[PDB]
């Protein structure tokens, strides 16, 4: 589990979105595994606005924060699941590292702030859904 809280928006994995996220939907994108919903309180997470390729991610399955080198966001093949069929998920970044399905929602961070959240995994490769391009989260 896990979310990003910035201004009056909440960012979660689209496959883990609640009924309340859907009732207060701002924007969702199946191909990115992203959903944004509105909040009453004002969040204060800082979004990175960079091209960093090193960061630190939180892994709930190990109660540890790990440093990783990740690829630039792109279209990558993600195996079928109970949430989506076999598809190409866009804006995805991979890193050599540990992850389990329940690790989705953990934040990836660089020196400049929040980069994105855990979204895919397997084969010892963790996939992060990027958020640095969503400039409207700050405005
Ligand atoms: C983070 N994580 C998810 C893992 C899975 C499952 C997985 O990747 N996905 C299932 C849920 C939806 C996902 C998507 N974005 O389409 C794909 C299996 C093993 C290890 C994992 N580490
Ligand atoms: Zn950065």
UniProtKB/Swiss-Prot annotation:
Positions that bind Zn(2+) 1: 50, 52, 110, 112
Transmembrane segments: none
Reaction equation(s) it catalyzes: Selective cleavage of Tyr-|-Gly bond in the picornavirus polyprotein
Location of the active site: 15 (for protease 2a activity), 33 (for protease 2a activity), 104 (for protease 2a activity)
Quaternary structure annotation from Swiss-Prot or TrEMBL: Homodimer.
Function field: Cysteine protease that cleaves viral polyprotein and specific host proteins. It is responsible for the autocatalytic cleavage between the P1 and P2 regions, which is the first cleavage occurring in the polyprotein. Also cleaves the host translation initiation factor EIF4G1, in order to shut down the capped cellular mRNA translation. Inhibits the host nucleus-cytoplasm protein and RNA trafficking by cleaving host members of the nuclear pores. Counteracts stress granule formation probably by antagonizing its assembly or promoting its dissassembly.
Protein name: Protease 2A
Source species: Coxsackievirus A16 (strain G-10)
């Amino acid at each position: 589990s896990g979310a990003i809280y910035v201004g009056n928006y909440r960012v979660v994995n689209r496959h883990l979105a609640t009924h309340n996220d859907w009732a207060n939907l701002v924007w969702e994108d199946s191909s990115r595994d992203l959903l944004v919903s509105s909040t009453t309180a004002q969040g204060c997470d800082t979004i990175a606005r960079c091209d960093c390729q090193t960061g630190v991610y939180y892994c709930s399955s190990r109660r540890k924060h790990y440093p990783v080198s990740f690829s630039k966001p792109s279209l990558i093949f993600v195996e079928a699941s109970e949430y989506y069929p076999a598809r190409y998920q866009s804006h995805l970044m991979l890193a050599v590292g540990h992850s389990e399905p329940g690790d989705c929602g953990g934040i990836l961070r660089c020196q400049h702030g929040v980069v994105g959240i855990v979204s895919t995994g397997g084969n010892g490769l963790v996939g992060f859904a990027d958020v640095r391009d969503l400039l409207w989260l700050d405005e």
